[PDB]
Design a protein around this ligand. Structure first.
Ligand SMILES: Nc1nc2cc(C(F)(F)F)ccc2n1Cc1ccco1
Lengths: 222, 220
């Protein structure tokens, strides 16, 4: 039976909010945020993983376009196929397309698989957020109400299920009975509530938050 | 000689900042803001003009796509061709595509002509803002730095001269040695400084602000 509220920040499973600047790397930040939590759960160590490693290395054979966008699922697939991802410390974020510079010497995490949740199932997304960890999702972020959000529970009647922005669901709850998803963005600590947005939950897959969810798992490190 | 600083809000030539919502009508808000200023300068009365009238009626013939974007200059051409535009009060903004509902009986303004300024010429834009009125421009707004802007003079190293968002230049000045354009947006009061942004001026056509400037005129 699921908790009424979850916040993976309280379990030490969520790194500081990142700023993607003028590079469309939301998909890469979403993916490494999902994997960071799995690394903490497995090892007890919270380590920022390299979004830049994904931008530079999870490219055309993964359907991804670096600063012009990508899939969280095919990011996880790169990490599986590459047998690792570098720490952010070793392979820092530059907000631009670079040649691949992955070095196994600075590998900080691996990925053995990823799980894709069923389209528009907010009940199933709630289970995965409670029991597995933070979940990579897409939202429709193409609304001034979204990018000028300051606080409270975001609800936008003009929102669609056509997602265009990769974000991380790190919990859920309710604010005076308005249910929400707790979403970590990569627009820096000045966006929203110190980089987070609470987005309407159980309002018909609002902004497509449950449209294409996925989460990675870790098997071996050595 | 041109003034050091200009602000057309000081002459009562600028309406309230509007909120376009989820409809890409920035081109329409920019076009009516530039015409609103000429209407005040002509009649002495400040009247908000119908961005919706443009979205609905300045369509295929003007290369405009309503909530999917358009051009301030072809909007001015619609007003010239149509022999008017309704007030915002008579033809309210709905943030969606609708059938043309223009009615000459609620006409609040006309347009006799529009002028397009030369590409990249911040000196010529300054002359127009000083001597003519607010100028419709496009900027490159596709930068988190732009939509997160809170105060000061916006400078983005990643900005390009490929413009995508219509806005209105209502002045210029110098804040702490940073030259700026004073820009009215259509993202409501929670964007920037109560709906305005100061954008870097004389920094090589920053964010394309002087790429495609235009202003309308009224004769009667
Ligand atoms: N002339 C002109 N006005 C423009 C307005 C916009 C804006 F998005 F801000 F509304 C973007 C481009 C614009 N151009 C250039 C052009 C020349 C042929 C096609 O487009």
């Amino acid at each position: 039976i699921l908790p009424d509220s979850v916040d993976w920040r309280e379990k030490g499973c969520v790194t500081e909010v990142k700023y993607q600047g003028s590079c469309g790397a939301c998909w890469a930040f979403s993916a490494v945020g999902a994997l960071e939590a799995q690394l903490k759960l497995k090892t007890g160590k919270l380590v920022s993983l390299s979004a830049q490693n994904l931008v530079d290395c999870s490219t055309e054979k993964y359907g991804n376009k670096g600063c012009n966008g990508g899939f969280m699922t095919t990011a996880f697939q790169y990490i599986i196929d590459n047998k690792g991802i570098d720490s952010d410390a070793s392979y820092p974020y530059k907000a631009m397309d670079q040649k691949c510079q992955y070095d196994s010497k600075y590998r900080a995490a691996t990925c053995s698989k990823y799980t894709e949740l069923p389209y528009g199932r907010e009940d199933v997304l709630k289970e995965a957020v409670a029991n597995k960890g933070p979940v990579s999702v897409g939202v429709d972020a193409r609304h001034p109400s979204f990018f000028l959000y300051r606080s409270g529970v975001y609800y936008e009647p003009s929102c669609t299920q056509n997602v265009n922005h990769g974000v991380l669901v790190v919990g859920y709850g309710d604010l005076n009975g308005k249910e929400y998803w707790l979403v970590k963005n990569s627009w820096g600590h000045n966006f929203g509530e110190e980089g987070y947005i609470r987005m309407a939950r159980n309002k018909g897959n609002h902004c497509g938050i449950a449209s294409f969810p996925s989460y990675p798992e870790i098997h071996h490190h050595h």
